[PDB]
């Protein structure tokens, strides 16, 4: 994507999003990040959306295959899918590490990237067969949690989405359903108590995410 203008990559990432062409969207966003400039809020979201969708289809495929797995073909093909997923996670992690996280000074960008780092290590963990990967997820989430708690209101969408994913990590990956539940509940309760400060639009944004915490808690309790 070396020869395409940054702005052109961003414009094409948005078109690919409209076209539900998420692999293209991700390639364009990777090109953009690799221009070496920081991403705006909107660009970070594009990056996240693109790879979430790519890796989301790989995760869904991997789980179908894994379950079938329970001659060598099923294992081979699950390995193939698994390998591709891991390569996607490695390239997201690569982008974070070169050099999105280190140049992210604001709480907004830094928590976003650290959350993302935890997410992609969590995806790696889902297929790992592993403690180091889980610890890399935990550590990235934890650093993101510490900044978000210090630097963002409890209703901030990224703070909420970070806490939601960290709670999922706890439940699904760290075998700590109590930690998962305590986190989701504490997150929801503190957001609830901060809603009064919001405009109607921010209120809608936060409560939409709080409902996922609530749905998880209903699933878990």
């Amino acid at each position: 994507m070396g020869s395409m203008e940054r702005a052109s990559l961003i414009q094409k990432a948005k078109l690919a999003e409209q076209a539900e062409r998420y692999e293209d969207m991700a390639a364009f966003m990777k090109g953009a990040v690799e221009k070496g400039e920081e991403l705006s809020c909107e660009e970070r979201n594009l990056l996240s959306v693109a790879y979430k969708n790519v890796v989301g289809g790989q995760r869904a495929a991997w789980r179908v295959l894994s379950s079938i797995e329970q001659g060598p073909e099923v294992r081979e093909y699950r390995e193939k899918v698994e390998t591709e997923l891991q390569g996607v996670c490695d390239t997201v992690l690569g982008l974070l590490d070169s050099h999105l996280i280190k140049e992210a000074g604001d709480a907004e960008s830094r928590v976003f990237y650290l959350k993302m780092k935890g997410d992609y290590y969590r995806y790696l963990a889902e297929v790992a067969t592993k403690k180091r990967i889980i610890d890399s997820a935990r550590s990235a989430y934890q650093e993101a949690m510490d900044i978000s708690k210090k630097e963002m209101p409890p209703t901030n969408p990224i703070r909420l989405g970070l806490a939601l994913n960290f709670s999922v990590f706890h439940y699904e990956i760290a075998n700590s359903p109590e930690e998962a539940i305590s986190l989701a509940k504490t997150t929801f309760d503190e957001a609830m108590a901060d809603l009064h400060t919001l405009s109607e639009d921010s209120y809608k944004d936060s409560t939409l995410i709080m409902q996922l915490l609530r749905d998880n808690l209903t699933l878990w309790t």
Binding site: N45, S48, V49, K52, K115, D119, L160, G161, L162, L164, N165, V168, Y171, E172, I209, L212, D215, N216, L219, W220
Partner: peptide, 6 residues
């Protein structure tokens, strides 16, 4: 369990 629907 739902994760952030980014």
């Amino acid at each position: 369990a739902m994760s952030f629907q980014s």
